[PDB]
């Protein structure tokens, strides 16, 4: 499944940030992110796509100080090509979510839980 693929890529990222000591930025600093609420629909994945820009910069920066993230680019590329499929056929819909404060780790965990909840409904 496509949603199956997205979940994996997120969990892979979370794994790296939890196992590699020098990946400190995604672990220690909070940013204002779009987080998923109880409202859960494939349309809401636009919110995730809007954050992919910033996320690449996070990974690129972490890479430059810790040479343990060589595959930063196509990581985001993989994520982007998977979410665009799930979004469905629609004019891009402005993200309708609240803007909340969290670390990159917490950000991933909440989009992971989002994916897992969809899987349950299908």
């Amino acid at each position, epitope marked *: 499944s496509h949603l199956e693929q997205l979940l*994996m890529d997120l*969990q*892979e990222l*979370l*794994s*790296r940030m*939890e*196992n*590699y*000591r*020098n990946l*400190k930025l995604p*672990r*220690m600093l909070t940013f204002k992110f779009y987080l998923p609420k109880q409202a859960t629909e494939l349309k809401d994945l636009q919110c995730l796509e809007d954050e992919l820009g910033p996320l690449r910069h996070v990974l690129d920066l972490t890479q430059s100080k810790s040479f*343990q993230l060589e*595959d930063a680019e196509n990581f985001i590329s993989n994520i982007r090509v998977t979410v665009v499929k799930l979004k469905g056929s629609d004019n891009t819909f402005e993200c309708q979510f609240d803007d909340e404060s969290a670390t990159v780790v917490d950000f991933l*965990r909440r989009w992971i*839980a989002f994916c897992q909840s969809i899987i349950s409904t299908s």
Partner: antibody
Amino acid sequence: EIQLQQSGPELRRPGSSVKLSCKASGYNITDYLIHWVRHRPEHGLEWIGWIDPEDGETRYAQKFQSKATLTADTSSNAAYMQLSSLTPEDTATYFCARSLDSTYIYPFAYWGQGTLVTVSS
Amino acid sequence: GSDIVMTQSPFSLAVSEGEMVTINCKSSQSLLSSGNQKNYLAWYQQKPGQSPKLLIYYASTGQSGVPDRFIGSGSGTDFTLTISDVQAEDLADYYCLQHYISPPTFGAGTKLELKA
């Protein structure tokens, strides 16, 4: 050569606090992470949290975020763990351990002799 | 509920000297890293009166000084610890540990006893 010496046994009433110490010798405690893991004979092994003694970063299991506070002192070459709001379920043997590599956070190795903490109603 | 669950079996085991022992660990999630191509799993041994000691990390790689009788195998969600030609000194508790995603979690353990 690498060793982690833990402080002695403790006795506490419920609601109390305890601070355990983990003194490193044979190496500089800054170079690796310090993990804390407890053992309860009926519940097995349970990871509590880790700390990076170089810059002080801490990571906790959600179960212990309010209860526990990890700490290091570079001068003493030592790490510390404090548990507050103790309950009888917190009766355990508390181990400190070191990360295996300097680069990777897990797994833990070179464990201490353990500190027995007994909480009595 | 979010935590990765380690189902370790068997709980207790008694065998004779020289026989082979099989400990199984099953995970609720794959522990394989897609980039590293490694499984984030370790095995610990706790002899009576002693602290836990690392036997095997990354599923199949033995720690220095660990005899060859100890073989870790497996991938994804199914893992196995093997002890061949089991010795009197192997009397201990054995735990699997995952660390693919925090918090790292232990299996319930395996008590191993030896007989003549």
